Write a protein that binds this ligand. Structure first.
Ligand SMILES: Nc1nc2c(ncn2[C@@H]2O[C@H](COP(=O)(O)OP(=O)(O)OP(=O)(O)O)[C@@H](O)[C@H]2O)c(=O)[nH]1
Ligand SMILES: Nc1ncnc2c1ncn2[C@@H]1O[C@H](COP(=O)(O)OP(=O)(O)CP(=O)(O)O)[C@@H](O)[C@H]1O
Ligand SMILES: Nc1nc2c(ncn2[C@@H]2O[C@H](COP(=O)(O)OP(=O)(O)O)[C@@H](O)[C@H]2O)c(=O)[nH]1
Ligand SMILES: [Ca+2]
Ligand SMILES: [Ca+2]
Ligand SMILES: [Ca+2]
Ligand SMILES: [Mg+2]
Ligand SMILES: [Mg+2]
Ligand SMILES: [Mg+2]
Lengths: 54, 423, 352, 438
C-alpha cells in the first residue's frame, strides 16, 4: 500500500498507489482505394444505361 | 432543403393524388389557394419537401399531373384544391389509353412522355437538393400503368441516383374495370421490380373489404376507397413532412434488405364506423394496426414473415406507453418476424394528429406475405394467357407474345424470391 | 405470455421444466437462436452471458451463475478453499487436497509429498485418491509413486486428496455410500435446500485391503450398475432416500439425520455459497441468474460430513424429478415471471 | 503548453460536441460571446485552458474544434444557437445530402468529395498550434457519416499528422434511441479501418446512458439533450486534466502510457458517480468511499458489462470536488477486501489517482444535481469485449443472408470488406480472450 509520484499544485494533486508488484497506408494507396471504388460505381452505372439503351 | 417531386399518372393516379394533396394541404395549413393559415411552426418546418414557395408567400404543390385523356384532370382543375396546382404541370393527351398497357408504354404514351419529362426536369432544376420522385398510379389500367412505368424507366435514366418511390394500386377482380387488368398489372410489376426503390402496394380488394366489413359501408365507391389511400399516404409521409428523427434514402437503406424485395403493405388505424367519438387507447391502436383486417394488401401476414417493419404514431400520447406496447406485439408473436435481422421493428412518434382524430397510427410492412398478392395476379394472368385471350388489343399496338412470356417468368421469379426468405 | 428458449437438449432436469412451463398455457417456447426470450435454458460449456440483458422491455433470466465454475471444477474448488479466507486452508470439512499438474504442462507436487512423507513417517493412514474433471479414470493407492506416475500419463489437470480410510458403512452389507443434496439459488440469492436427498450406495462390501478393485470404493451410479455384482439387492437402484436412511440411523446409532448429518450439510452449503456471493450475484446486474446445484458428501465412522465435489449441471434421482422441478418454477421462475405448500425447500438465511 | 484539436463527425458527434463545449465554457468561465473576465492576459497566454481555446486580440476565446456533417440540418443549429459567436464559419463544414446510414456512402461516395475541404479547415487550426498534441474525435458507430467518414478522416490524419496522437469518443449503437437497422454493419466496418489509427477510444453505449437517465434522473423517455448533457460530464471529467493545472494525464500521450499497454486493446471502460436528479428535494451528499465504491457497480458504467469476470490492465481515478488523498486510499482498501479485482500478471496491481478540487460544474437548468464530490474511473478490463460479442453476433445474423449488403456494394465497396472487417473483429475478440481467461 505505497504512494509514489505525489505531485501537488493549487488546483489539485495526483499520485500513484501500488497494491502488488507484477509477476499504415500512404497517400497513394488511399487515393487508389477511393478511385477503385469510384471505378466500380462508373462501371455499374454503365451497365445500367447500357440496359436502359437496350 | 430535401425536396420530393410528385407525379400522378392516369385516372386512378390523379384521383388519388388529388385527395392526398387535399389531405396534406389541410395538415400543413394550406388552403385551396395556396395560402398558409395555420397556428404552429411545425406545419411549415418541412413544408418545402412537397411544396414550392412562390411570390407573396404562396405554396404551390410540387406535383405533375399526367394523363392521356382530359376527362379526369379536368375534374381536378375544377375540384376543391384544383387551383393550387401549377397550370403548366397539367400534361395530358386526347386519344386516351383504352385501358391498354401497350398504349401507355409504347404508342400513345410514347408521344407524350418527352413533354411530361420536360416538366419533371423543370421542378428538379429548382430543388436545392432533390431527394427523389414519388408516383401515384394504378397497375390495372392503361396510362398510370403503361405510361407511369414508362416515366419511371425514363426518370431513372436522367436521375440514376435519386430515389424512385411509388404508391401502386393493385387490381382486384372484385373491383374490376376490365378483364385485362391482370395483363396490365403483370407488365408493370416487372418495371417496378427493376426500377423502383419502394412501392406501397394497395390492393383494391383489401380497400373494398375494409369499407364493406370493418367500416360497414353498404355499397363502396372509388371515393370511399380513396379516403383510405389519403389517410394512408398522409401517414407514411409523416416521417418526411414533419420534424422527426428521416429522408427517402434512409428509409430504403433501413427497409430493403434485398434489391428486388421492396414492395410494402401499408396499414392504418383506427378504422371506426359512424361509436366514432370513443377515445382510442394505445393498446387498441396497436392491436388493430397489426390486425390483417386493417391492412391494404389483402394478404394474411400469418401466412408469411416480416423482414422489416416501421410504425408511426400521431398525436399527443405517452411515448413510454407506445414503446411498451410495440415491444409487446413482437414478444407475443415472434414467430411471424424473421430472426436474422436484429431490431427489425422501429417506432416514430408525431405530435400533429390527422384531421379529426385524437391519435392514429400508420403501418409499413415489408412482409413476405406479399407473395400471395403476386400469386393471384400471376394466376389470373396465366388463366387468360394460356388461351391468348385479349392478346390482340396488345399485339395490335406492336407487342409480341414473347414479351408476355417474359413478364410472366419475371414475376414467378419474384414469388420464388419471397419464398426462399420465408423459411 | 412468457417466452423461453432451450440450448441444452441433453439436460434431463430442464427438459422437464420446459414441459411444465408449456403445461401452464402461459409460457411459449422459441427457437434456440431467437433473442426475444424471457427465460434461457443455456448450454453447459461456453454459455454467452454477455448477450443477456440488452433487449429493451424484456426482463431476461438465465439458469446458470456466471463464475459458478470456480466451485464446480475439481481443481477450481481446491484453489478456492485454500485461498479464500472465508474457508482457509485449515477448513475442517474439506479433505486435505492438492492440485497436481501432469509433468507435460500453480502445481502442488512438492507440498503433497511433504504432507505425504509426514504421514508415511507417522504410521497414520496414507491412502490417497487421484481424480480429474475430464474423467468417467481414478486411481486409489497408498503409494505416492503410483499416484504421481498416473497423473503424468494423462494430459489434463488432476487432484490428489486424502481417501477416507474410515468411511461410514451401512448394515447389513458393510458397504460405502455418498449423499447427494440439491440446492436451488434464485435471483435474490436465497439458498433453498431440497428437503429430499439421496444416498448412492455401494453394493459391494467395503474392502480397505484392496484399492485395486474400485467397485467397493466408488459409489458412482454408473460404476455400481456395471462393475458391481449386488446392484439392487438391499435397496432399489443403490438409492436410499431420507426416510429409510433416517430410520436406519435411529435403529442403529440412536440419532437422527437432521442432527448427525443434516446440520453439517446445511452449514457447508451456506459457507460455500456465501463465499462467492460478491462475485456471482446478479443483484445489480442487467439480467438475473439462478442455478441448481448438487452437492456430494462423505460420512466417516465418526459421523463427520466431508465435501467431495459440487456439480453445476447435475442430474436428479428418478423418484424426485416431479416435486423438485415444480419447486424450481415456484421459487426461481414464477418468482420473477408470475402466473395468472408447505414449501418443498428449507431456506438457509444468511447475511448478503 | 500544447494544443488539442477536437473534431466532431456526424449528428451524434456534433450534438455531443455541443454539450461538451457548452460545459467547457461554464467550467472555465467563458461567456457565450467568447469573453472571459477571469483571464488577465488579453489576446494570448499559454495557460491550461489554452489547450482547448485560442484567443483573439479582441479578447475572444475560440474553441479549437471542427464540426463536420454531410447534411447541414444539425450544424445549422450551432450557427444560430446560443453559442453562435463562439466559432467562426470556417469551423463548421456541412454537405447537402447525408450518407443514409450507409458506411460505404460516408467513406467512399460522399467522403472523397469533402475530405480535402475538412483537412484544410483542420490544417488552419493546426497552423496556430505551437506544439499540437493530437485530436479528440467524437462520432457514432451507427451513422453513415460518423462511421464511414470518420475512418477516412483518421486514415488521413495519420498521414498529415504522423507522430500526433488521436483519441476517440465513440457512441455504441443502442436500439432504444435508434431507427437504423444496419448500424451493426457500420460499427464493425468503422472499427476495422479505424483500429490501427486510434491510440485510445472511449465507447459510450447509448443503452447505458439511457438507463442512467431513467433510473437516476427519473426521465421516462430521455431526449438526445438529456443523453448528451450526461455524456459531456464524463467527457469533461476525462479531459479536465488537459484543461486544468495538474500532473496526471497532462497531454494526450499520457492516455496510452497509462491505459493502453497493448495497442489493439485500446478501449477503456468508463464509470461515473454520482448521478443525482436535480428534481430531488435534497440528496444526502455521498462520501469518498461511497462514490468510489459505486465505481464497481454495473449500474453506472458507460458500457453494460461485468468487470468481475475479466482482468484489469490499467486503472485511473479522476476525482473532482472535496476529496483528499487520505480518503481515496481509505476507500480503496475497503473495496479490495469486498470487490472482485483480478489483474493481469504482467501489469502492476495499482491505481493512478487524480484529484481536481473544482467540483463538477452544473449546467443551468440541466438534469444533474450539484454534488460536492464526483469521480470518474477509467479501467481497461477485458470485460468490455462483451460489447464486441453482442455486435459481432448481430453482424453474423445479417451477413449470413447477405442482407443489406447491396446498399454497401452499390456505393463502390467490395463485398469482401465485410468478411475482412469481421475476421478482424474475430481477431480482436480472440486477443481479448487470450488476456483474460485462463
Ligand atoms: N448519445 C447520442 N447518440 C446519438 C446522438 N445522435 C445520434 N446518436 C446515435 O447515432 C446513431 C446514428 O448515427 P448518426 O450520428 O445519427 O448518423 P450520422 O453521423 O449523422 O451519419 P448519417 O447516416 O449520414 O446521418 C444512432 O444509433 C443514435 O443512437 C446524440 O445526440 N447523442
Ligand atoms: N477422499 C476420498 N475418500 C473416500 N472416497 C472418495 C474420496 N474421493 C472420492 N471418493 C469416492 O469417489 C466418488 C466421487 O467421485 P467424484 O465425484 O470425484 O467423480 P465424479 O465427479 O465423476 C462423480 P459425480 O457424478 O458425483 O460428479 C464418491 O462416491 C466417493 O465414494
Ligand atoms: N383505389 C382506386 N382505384 C382505382 C380508382 N380508379 C380506378 N382504379 C383502379 O385502376 C384500374 C384501372 O386503371 P385506370 O385508373 O383506369 O388507369 P388509366 O388508364 O391510367 O386511367 C382498375 O383496376 C380500378 O380498380 C380510384 O379512384 N381509386
Ligand atoms: Ca397518335
Ligand atoms: Ca489569456
Ligand atoms: Ca498512428
Ligand atoms: Mg379509367
Ligand atoms: Mg461431476
Ligand atoms: Mg446525419
Amino acid at each position: 500500500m505505497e504512494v509514489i509520484e505525489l505531485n501537488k499544485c493549487t488546483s489539485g494533486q495526483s499520485f500513484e498507489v501500488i497494491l502488488k508488484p507484477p509477476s499504415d497506408p500512404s497517400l497513394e494507396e488511399i487515393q487508389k482505394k477511393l478511385e477503385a471504388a469510384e471505378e466500380r460505381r462508373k462501371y455499374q452505372e454503365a451497365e445500367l444505361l447500357k440496359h436502359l439503351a437496350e | 432543403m430535401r425536396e420530393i417531386v410528385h407525379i400522378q399518372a392516369g385516372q386512378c393516379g390523379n384521383q388519388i393524388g388529388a385527395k392526398f394533396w387535399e389531405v396534406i394541404s389541410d395538415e400543413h395549413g394550406i388552403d385551396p389557394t395556396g395560402s398558409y393559415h395555420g397556428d404552429s411552426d411545425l406545419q411549415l418546418e418541412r413544408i418545402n419537401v412537397y411544396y414550392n414557395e412562390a411570390t407573396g408567400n404562396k405554396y404551390v404543390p410540387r406535383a405533375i399531373l399526367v394523363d392521356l385523356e382530359p376527362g379526369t384532370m379536368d375534374s381536378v382543375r375544377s375540384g376543391p384544391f384544383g387551383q393550387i396546382f401549377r397550370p403548366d404541370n397539367f400534361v395530358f393527351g386526347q386519344s386516351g389509353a383504352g385501358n391498354n398497357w401497350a398504349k401507355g408504354h409504347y404508342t400513345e404514351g410514347a408521344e407524350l412522355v418527352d413533354s411530361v419529362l420536360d416538366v419533371v426536369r423543370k421542378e428538379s432544376e429548382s430543388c436545392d437538393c432533390l431527394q427523389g420522385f414519388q408516383l401515384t398510379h394504378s397497375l390495372g389500367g392503361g396510362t398510370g400503368s403503361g405510361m407511369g412505368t414508362l416515366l419511371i424507366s425514363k426518370i431513372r435514366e436522367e436521375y440514376p441516383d435519386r430515389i424512385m418511390n411509388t404508391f401502386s394500386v393493385m387490381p382486384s377482380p372484385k373491383v374490376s374495370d376490365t378483364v385485362v387488368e391482370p395483363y396490365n398489372a403483370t407488365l408493370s410489376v416487372h418495371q417496378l421490380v427493376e426500377n423502383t426503390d419502394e412501392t406501397y402496394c394497395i390492393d383494391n380488394e383489401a380497400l373494398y373489404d375494409i369499407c364493406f366489413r370493418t367500416l360497414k359501408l353498404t355499397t363502396p365507391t372509388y371515393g370511399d376507397l380513396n379516403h383510405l389511400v389519403s389517410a394512408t399516404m398522409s401517414g407514411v409521409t409523416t416521417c418526411l413532412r414533419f420534424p422527426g428523427q428521416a429522408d427517402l434514402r434512409k428509409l430504403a437503406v433501413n427497409m430493403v434488405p434485398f434489391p428486388r424485395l421492396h414492395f410494402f403493405m401499408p396499414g392504418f388505424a383506427p378504422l371506426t364506423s359512424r361509436q366514432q367519438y370513443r377515445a382510442l387507447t394505445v393498446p387498441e391502436l396497436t392491436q388493430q394496426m397489426f390486425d390483417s383486417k386493417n391492412m391494404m394488401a389483402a394478404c394474411d401476414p400469418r401466412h408469411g414473415r416480416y423482414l422489416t417493419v416501421a410504425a408511426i404514431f400521431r398525436g399527443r400520447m405517452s411515448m413510454k406507453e407506445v414503446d411498451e406496447q410495440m415491444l409487446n406485439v413482437q414478444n407475443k408473436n415472434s414467430s411471424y418476424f424473421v430472426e436474422w435481422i436484429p431490431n427489425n421493428v422501429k417506432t416514430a412518434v408525431c405530435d400533429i394528429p390527422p384531421r379529426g382524430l385524437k391519435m392514429s397510427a400508420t403501418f409499413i410492412g415489408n412482409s413476405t406475405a406479399i407473395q400471395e398478392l403476386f400469386k393471384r395476379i400471376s394466376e389470373q394472368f396465366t388463366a387468360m394467357f394460356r388461351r391468348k385471350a385479349f392478346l390482340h388489343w396488345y399485339t395490335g399496338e406492336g407487342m409480341d407474345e414473347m414479351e408476355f412470356t417474359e413478364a410472366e417468368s419475371n414475376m414467378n421469379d419474384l414469388v420464388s424470391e419471397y419464398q426462399q426468405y420465408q423459411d | 405470455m412468457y417466452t423461453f428458449v432451450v440450448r441444452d437438449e441433453n439436460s434431463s432436469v430442464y427438459a422437464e421444466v420446459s414441459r411444465l412451463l408449456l403445461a401452464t398455457g402461459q409460457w411459449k417456447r422459441l427457437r434456440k437462436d431467437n433473442p426475444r426470450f424471457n427465460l434461457m435454458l443455456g448450454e453447459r460449456n461456453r454459455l454467452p452471458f454477455g448477450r443477456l440483458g440488452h433487449e429493451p422491455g424484456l426482463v431476461q433470466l438465465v439458469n446458470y451463475y456466471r463464475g459458478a465454475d470456480k466451485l464446480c471444477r475439481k481443481a477450481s474448488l481446491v484453489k478456492l478453499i485454500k485461498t479464500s479466507p472465508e474457508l482457509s486452508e485449515s477448513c475442517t470439512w474439506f479433505p486435505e487436497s492438492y492440485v497436481i499438474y501432469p509433468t507435460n504442462l500453480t502445481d502442488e507436487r512438492e507440498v503433497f509429498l511433504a504432507a505425504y512423507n509426514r504421514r508415511r513417517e507417522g504410521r497414520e493412514g496414507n491412502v490417497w485418491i487421484a481424480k480429474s474433471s475430464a474423467g468417467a479414470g481414478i486411481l486409489i493407492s497408498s503409494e505416492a509413486s503410483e499416484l504421481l506416475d498416473f497423473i503424468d500419463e494423462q494430459g489434463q489437470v488432476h487432484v490428489i486428496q486424502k481417501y477416507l480410510e474410515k468411511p461410514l458403512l451401512l448394515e447389513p452389507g458393510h458397504r460405502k455410500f455418498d449423499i447427494r443434496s440439491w440446492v436451488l439459488v434464485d435471483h435474490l440469492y436465497n439458498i433453498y435446500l431440497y428437503r429430499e436427498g439421496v444416498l448412492r450406495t455401494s453394493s459391494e462390501p467395503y474392502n480397505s485391503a484392496n484399492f485395486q478393485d474400485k467397485t467397493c470404493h466408488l459409489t458412482n451410479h454408473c460404476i455400481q450398475k456395471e462393475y458391481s455384482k449386488n446392484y439392487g439387492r438391499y435397496e432399489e437402484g443403490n438409492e436410499m432416500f431420507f426416510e429409510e436412511f433416517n430410520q436406519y440411523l435411529m435403529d442403529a446409532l440412536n440419532t437422527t439425520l437432521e442432527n448427525s448429518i443434516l446440520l453439517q450439510i446445511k452449514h457447508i452449503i451456506r459457507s460455500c455459497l456465501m463465499c462467492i456471493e460478491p462475485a456471482i450475484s446478479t443483484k445489480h446486474l442487467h439480467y438475473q441468474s439462478f442455478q441448481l446445484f448438487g452437492f456430494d458428501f462423505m460420512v466417516d465412522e465418526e459421523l463427520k460430513v466431508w465435501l467431495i465435489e459440487v456439480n453445476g449441471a447435475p442430474a436428479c434421482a428418478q423418484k424426485l424429478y416431479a416435486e423438485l422441478c415444480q419447486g424450481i418454477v415456484d421459487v426461481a421462475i414464477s418468482s420473477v415471471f408470475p402466473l395468472a405448500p408447505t414449501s418443498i425447500f428449507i431456506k438457509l438465511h444468511h447475511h448478503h | 503548453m500544447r494544443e488539442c484539436i477536437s473534431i466532431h463527425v456526424g449528428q451524434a458527434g456534433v450534438q455531443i460536441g455541443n454539450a461538451c463545449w457548452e460545459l467547457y465554457c461554464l467550467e472555465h468561465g467563458i461567456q457565450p460571446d467568447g469573453q472571459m473576465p477571469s483571464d488577465k492576459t488579453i489576446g494570448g497566454g499559454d495557460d491550461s485552458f489554452n489547450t482547448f481555446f485560442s484567443e483573439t486580440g479582441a479578447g475572444k476565446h475560440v474553441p479549437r474544434a471542427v464540426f463536420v456533417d454531410l447534411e447541414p440540418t444539425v450544424i445549422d443549429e450551432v450557427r444560430t444557437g446560443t453559442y453562435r459567436q463562439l466559432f467562426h464559419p470556417e469551423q463548421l463544414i456541412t454537405g447537402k445530402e447525408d450518407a443514409a446510414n450507409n458506411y460505404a456512402r460516408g467513406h467512399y461516395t460522399i467522403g472523397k468529395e469533402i475530405i480535402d475541404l475538412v483537412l484544410d479547415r483542420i490544417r488552419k487550426l493546426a497552423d496556430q498550434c505551437t506544439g499540437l498534441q493530437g485530436f479528440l474525435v467524437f462520432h457514432s458507430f451507427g451513422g453513415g457519416t460518423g462511421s464511414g467518414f470518420t475512418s477516412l478522416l483518421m486514415e488521413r490524419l495519420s498521414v498529415d499528422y504522423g507522430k500526433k496522437s488521436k483519441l476517440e469518443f465513440s457512441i455504441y449503437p443502442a436500439p432504444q434511441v435508434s431507427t437504423a437497422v444496419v448500424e451493426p454493419y457500420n460499427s464493425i466496418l468503422t472499427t476495422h479501418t479505424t483500429l490501427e489509427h486510434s491510440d485510445c477510444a472511449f465507447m459510450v453505449d447509448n443503452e447505458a446512458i439511457y438507463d442512467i437517465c431513467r433510473r437516476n434522473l427519473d426521465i421516462e423517455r430521455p431526449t438526445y439533450t438529456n443523453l448528451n448533457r450526461l455524456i459531456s460530464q464524463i467527457v469533461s471529467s476525462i479531459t479536465a486534466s488537459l484543461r486544468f493545472d495538474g500532473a496526471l494525464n497532462v497531454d494526450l500521450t499520457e492516455f496510452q502510457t497509462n491505459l493502453v499497454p497493448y495497442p489493439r486493446i485500446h478501449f477503456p471502460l468508463a464509470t461515473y458517480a454520482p448521478v443525482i436528479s436535480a428534481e430531488k428535494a435534497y440528496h444526502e451528499q455521498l462520501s469518498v468511499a461511497e462514490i468510489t465504491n459505486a465505481c464497481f457497480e454495473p449500474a453506472n458504467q458507460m458500457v453494460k458489462c461485468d468487470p468481475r469476470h475479466g482482468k484489469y490492465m490499467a486503472c485511473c481515478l479522476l476525482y473532482r470536488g472535496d476529496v483528499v488523498p487520505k480518503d481515496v486510499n481509505a476507500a480503496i482498501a475497503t473495496i479490495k477486501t469486498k470487490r472482485s479485482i483480478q489483474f493481469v500478471d504482467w501489469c502492476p496491481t495499482g491505481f493512478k489517482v487524480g484529484i481536481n478540487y473544482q467540483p463538477p460544474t452544473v449546467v443551468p437548468g440541466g438534469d444533474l444535481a450539484k454534488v460536492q464530490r464526483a469521480v470518474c474511473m477509467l479501467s481497461n478490463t477485458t470485460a468490455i469485449a462483451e460489447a464486441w460479442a453482442r455486435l459481432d453476433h448481430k453482424f453474423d445474423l445479417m451477413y449470413a443472408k447477405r442482407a443489406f449488403v447491396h446498399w454497401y456494394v452499390g456505393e463502390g465497396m467490395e463485398e469482401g470488406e465485410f468478411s475482412e472487417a469481421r475476421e478482424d473483429m474475430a481477431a480482436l475478440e480472440k486477443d481479448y480472450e487470450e488476456v483474460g481467461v485462463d
